[PDB]
Symmetry: none
Subunit: 169 residues, 10 copies
C-alpha cells in the first residue's frame, strides 16, 4: 500500500455524535479523507492532539475533508472515553468519528500495526476524492502531529489538482 | 491445545489491586488456575458473571485456585473499568486479576479468539498444579457461565487427584 | 470445529427404545441437540451421569431438545449394556438414544477423540435448530457433567434466540 | 507388513484369568504366537470359533505356542462378554487371552482393519519364536477359521525350522 | 489390494491341456476363482501341492470354481515342466491351468511378489463371482497349502452368500 | 522498512561543498539525519523546497542533525544543477550534501521509488543517533515539505530521548 | 535477447529540436535504426562521439537510418545539457534525438545496464526495417565509437538484403 | 549406461559345468567379458547361437575373454535346459556359464529389459579388463548373433588396446 | 528410447552424388534404412569403413535398403572431403548420402553423442520400412564395422518380415 | 558473461603454423586477446576477413595482442582448410591460430552460438591482460569485420590503461 495507489477501504463501528454508528469509506466520496491512527485509549498522557483535531474539525469540513480517528480498541471503550471529561483525561465531546479497529484489519492494511503490541503506530493518511493516497505521515509513539501542517498539505493537494502544477522560475 | 495436554503458558499486564502489575501463569504454581475469558470491556450489559466470580473469589481461594479474568482489551481500558463504579456498570473493586490480551495472542493459544471480530469467545479453562488442562467450557457470546459449576468441577478434580 | 460454526452432522446405529436402529442428525432439525460423549461401556464406575440424563429426559423434551449419548463402542456392546440391569452396573432402560461411533469418526469430527486410547473425552455439545454450535464442554475422564447446568445453558440460548 | 518380515510387536490390556491384565508380545519369546482377529463382541452369531480355539488351547500348548485373541473392543467389553455365559451367547471361561485393541493400531499394523467400519477382518497370523511372521490368513467377515489347519501350519513350520 | 475389495484382473499365456493358450480372468465370471501362487518351476522339491490341486480339480468343478496355478516363470518353462514325468520330479498331466507371470505384474498386484528374488510367495486367493476378494492365505516358502481347507472356505462363502444362526436364549 | 527499525544504511557520491565527494551514512555519528527525497533534477519548477533547507541549514546543524537531499540522478547532473544559477531555476550554492542514487537502491531501501518512472517520491526520513527510524513523511509529487515541521519533529524526538 | 532476434521496442520522452517530445520506435518504420547508448550526461569528458553522430546525421539519413542516442538520465537533464553550449562542454544543438531511459527498462532490455551503477555501457545496436537486430557493439566506458564503421555495417546489411546473396571463389 | 562408461557389475547363481554355483563379474577382472542376453529357455526354436558360443568357447578363452550367457529365467530352469538333450531341443553340455537374472535387475542395468514382457532383448556387451564398456549389440528377438563378428570385435579391441 | 520403438525421424543437408541436397528420413519409405555414424571428417586414418559401405551400396539397393553415413560436421566439410581424392585421405566418390548433423540433434536422439568431445560414437542403426528400430550396434571409436554383418542382419529381418 | 566482467577461459586444439597443437587462453598473459568467431569452414565465399587478420597480424603483435580465430569445426577440418590453397578457396598459410570448438562450449560461453544450427555468429571479443572483457562486437552472418576498427579499439583501451 503506497502513495499514488488506491487507499484501502475501511468500515466499522465508530462513535458519531455521542452514539455508536457504523461508518464506511464509500460514504465519503467527492471528499478528502484523513485517517488518523493513535495507539490506545485511557492512556495516562493527556490526549491533546486528537482533541485538537476534533475542535478544529470545522476547518476540515470547510475543505471538504472528513477526519476520522481510529484505534485498535473496541467502539465501546471509545464511547466510554467520549463520555469521560477531558479534565479527567477523557475526550469529552468529539466532533469527529472515533473508529474501532478491534479486528486490526485496518491498521495492517495501512501498515501501521505493531503485531507484537497489538497497537497501531501514530500514522496519518490523506486520501483524495478519487480514493487515492496522496500522503502518509508515520510517527513513533512519543511524537504527535500538528493540525496546521495537515491542513497545509490538504490545501496544497486541492490546489495542485484544480491548478495543474505550475510556476516556473 | 486440548484437554489432557499442558496448557499454554501466559503472561502480561493485568489490573490487580486497582493498580497495573505484570503477572505470569507460573506465579500461581501449586495452585489450580481458572482462566476466564470475556469478549470486551464497557459493554452495555451489566457484568454480573465476572463480578460473581470476583465476589465469590474466597470460595476459590479455599479450594486453592487462582481465578483470572482475561480479555483482548488494553490494560488501560481494564483499569478504567475497575475504577468505574458498579452502579454505572463498572467492575468496582476486583479481588481477582483482570488480564490484558491486546496482542490477542492468548485468546489465539486457547483457540477462543474470533479472528473476524478481534474478540474472545466465552471460554473457561481449568489447569491443575502440574500445568495440565483438565477442563474447557466454551460458550457462544449470549450465554454466561455459572460460578457453582466451576467450583464443582474444581472440587471434583481435586478429589479425583487425591483419590 | 469451533463455536458459532455449523456443528458436524452425525449418523450411525444407536440403541433406541431397546432396539438397534439407524439414526441421523438431520432427523432432528428444528430441535436443539445435546451431544453427550462418554469414554467406554462396562466401566466399573457406576454410570450415574448418563442415567441421570436418561431419567431427566422429559425436562429436555419439554424444551424440545434431543439428547444423544454417544461412544466409540459397537452398537452391540451398547445393546448389551442396555440389556444389563442397573444393579449389575448396566444402563437398564435408556430413554435417550445411545449411539455407536465404532469408526471413531464422530469423536474425531468433534475433536474429543484420544488417538492413543481410541476413546472419547467427556465432551458435551449444544446445537441450535440451524445446526450451529452454541456450546461445548470438555471434561477430562475423571469428572462428570451436571444435568441442571446443561438445561440452564439450553434455556439461556433459547431465550437469546427468542428475543 | 508382509510374510518373512519381523511381525509387528503388540501389547495391551487383555482378559486372561477372568481378570484384566496387561500383556505384551515380548512376554512370549521362545514360543510361537498365533494372533487371532475377530470383528466385534456381542454379535448375535454364536462365537463358535473363538470358543473352539480356547477349548482346544491344550493342543497349542503342546506345540509351545501361545494363541491370542484380539479385537477392537475395550477390555471392559471383553470382560463383560467373558462374564456372559455361553448359553446366552457369551464366551464364558476363556483359556486364551482376549486382547483389546481400542486404538485400532494393532489391526492397522496387521492391515486387517476396515477403517470405514472400525472393525477388524477375520485375520490370523503365525509368528515364530524369533518373532518373524510365517503365515497370514485373511478371511472376509462371514467365514471362520479351522483350528486343525492352524495346528497343521504350526507343526509344519516348526518341522521346517528344525530341518 | 485387500479382502473385500475387487481382486485385480489377470490374463496371460498359460499351459492348458498340454498347449500354450491365452487365458483371461473375465472368462470365469460365473465361477469362483482360486489363484494359486508358487515360487518356481524345476525346484528340487517334489511339487506335491500343485499336483494335489490338479488331481482334486473335479471337486472344485463340482463347486463351480476355477483353480489356476500361477508362477513368474515363462509358459515355455511351464510346458517343459508339464512334459516332465512326475516320477522324474515333473508335473506330468495338469488338469488345471498353469499361468505364466513373466512380467511379474500379477504377483505384484496380489502383493505376493518378492522383488529382490523375482519370485512369488506361496499365496492363495479366493475370488467370488462378483470378482471380489474373499480370502487370502500367504505361506512362507517351506510350508504348503491344504486342498481340503480351500474347499471348505469356498463352500463356506458360497453358503454364506446364498444364506447366520444366533446362539441366543 | 518500518518505523522503530534501524534505518537502511546508504552511501554514494554526492555534491557537498560544491565538489563531488564520496559520502556515507556512518560519517555522521552523534547526529540525527534528515533524508530528503525529491524526484528529479532540472525540473522547471523553482526548487524552493531544497533551497529552503539549504538556507535554513544552520537551524538543523544547531540541533546536531544532518540534512541530506537525495535523488536518482547522477552526481554529475547534481553538480550541473548546483552550478546553475537560481535565476535560471538552478540551485546555486548548496550547504547540504546532495546525493546521487543512480542505482535507485537507496530509494528502494526507503521504499519511495516509483519503479515505473525511475524517480523517488517526496519522502522524508528522520534517523536518530542510534540509527533507528523515527518518522517518515511521504508526499505525492505536487506537494512539498515544510521546514518548521521537520524541525518541530526533530525537536520532539530529541527532547523525548533527553 | 540476441542478434537475429527481433529487437525490443522502446519508447519514451526524448529531446527533439530543443524540445521534449514523446518518441516511439514504431515512428521510424521502413527505416534502419541505430540505437546509441551512452552512460551519463554532464560528464567532464568532451562528448566528441555523440557530437560526431549528431553532425554526420545527414549521412545516416541518406542511407535511410535513424540514429537515436539514449541514456538513463531524465529528459530534463537531457534538455539542460542540450541547452549548454559545446564550448562549455555541453551538447549544444543536437540534430539527432536524445532519449531518456530513467526507468532503465530499455538499457535492461538491451542488456547494457550496469545494475550496480544504474548506468548503460557504451552500447550500439543496428536494427533493420523488419525490426530484427543485425549487429551489436558494446564497449566498456573508457572507449568511444566510430561513425564510419557503423556506416560500413549498415550499408553492408542493406547491400546483402538487396543483393541475394553470396559469390563463390 | 553408455559406451566408454564403466559397465555395471553383475552377479548371481549360474549353472556351471552342469551344477549351480554363485558367480560374480569381478571374478573375471583380468579378462574381457562378453555378456550374452537371451529372451527365454525352452523356446520351440533350436538354440543354435548360444550353443555355437559354448562350442567355440575355446577361441574366446584363447583371447582371454569370458563369455557369459544370461536370461531372466530361474537358475533351476536353466539347469533343466542344460540337462535336457539337444536332440529334444535342450542345450546339453554348456562350456560357458548360464546366469539367472530372475530379479530382472541385470537386464534393466544393461537396458535390454522389456518391462512389459519380462524378457531380455538379444543384447550383447563387450567389457574390457578395466571394466569399461567397449561395445554393445542389440538385436530384436527374431535375429541372432554371429560368433565370428564378436571375435573380430574382441581381437580388434585387444589390438587397439596395445598400440 | 530403444529397439522395438519407432526410430527417431531425422533430417538435414547431406552430400548426394557429389552435390549438397536437403534430405529427410521420410523420403525413404517402403525401404529399410541404415543409419551409419562416424566420429569426424579429415582424420589422418584411412576412411576404409565408409568407403567400404559406399562401394557395396548396390548390394543394399538389392535389399531395398538405404545406407546413410552421418556425422556432426558441416555439409561443407563433407563436400570438401568428398571432393578430396582418396589418395591423401579423402572420400572420393560416395555412392551413399553423407549427412551433416551440425546441430548434433541427431547424434543425441540416437544417443551416440559424446557431449564432451562434440563427436558421435561409431554407432549403427537398422530401421524397418515401418520405421521401428530393429538393431543397434555401437562401437567405441577405435573399432570399425563390418559390412557383411549389416547385410546378414538386414536379410534376417526382411526374411522375418516375410515370414 | 558480459562486458566489464572477467572473460571466460577457453582452450582446445587449434591449427598453429600448419600443424595441430593444443592452445590455451592463459598461454597469453601480458597480452590482449582478440577472439574471432566465424560460422563455418569451406564456405563458397572467399574468406577475405580471416585472411585479412592473418595477413595484418604484425600490427597486432606490435600492439601486444594475440588474435585467435575460432569455429565450431574440428581441428582436422581446420587443418584441411589451411592445407587448401587460397586460389582454390582455402586459407592457405595462416599466421594466426585457428581454434576448434567442436564441443561448442566456447561459442556458448561467449553466447554467440546458434543452438539450432550449431554454428557461431560473427562475434568478436577483446580481452585485456587482466583477462577482463573490454569489448564485444556481434555481427549477423552476412557481414564481416574491419581490422582497422579492431586495432583502433585495442589502441584506445591500452591508451586508457596507461593514462
Amino acid at each position: 500500500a503506497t502513495v499514488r495507489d488506491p487507499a484501502p477501504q475501511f468500515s466499522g463501528k465508530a462513535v458519531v455524535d455521542g452514539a455508536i454508528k457504523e461508518i464506511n469509506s464509500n460514504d465519503y466520496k467527492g471528499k478528502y479523507i484523513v485517517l488518523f491512527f493513535y495507539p490506545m485509549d485511557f492512556t495516562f498522557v493527556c490526549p491533546t492532539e486528537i482533541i485538537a483535531f476534533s475542535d478544529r474539525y470545522l476547518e476540515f469540513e470547510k475543505l471538504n475533508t472528513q477526519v476520522i480517528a481510529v484505534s485498535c480498541d473496541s467502539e465501546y471503550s471509545h464511547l466510554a472515553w467520549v463520555n469521560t471529561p477531558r479534565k479527567k483525561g477523557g475526550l469529552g465531546e468529539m466532533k469527529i468519528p472515533v473508529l474501532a479497529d478491534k479486528s486490526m484489519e485496518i491498521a495492517r492494511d495501512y501498515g501501521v500495526l505493531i503485531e507484537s503490541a497489538g497497537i497501531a503506530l501514530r500514522g496519518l493518511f490523506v486520501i483524495d476524492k478519487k480514493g487515492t493516497l496522496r500522503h502518509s505521515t508515520i510517527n513513533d509513539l512519543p511524537v504527535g502531529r500538528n493540525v496546521d501542517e495537515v491542513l497545509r498539505v490538504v490545501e496544497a493537494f486541492q490546489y495542485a489538482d484544480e491548478n495543474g502544477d505550475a510556476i516556473p522560475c
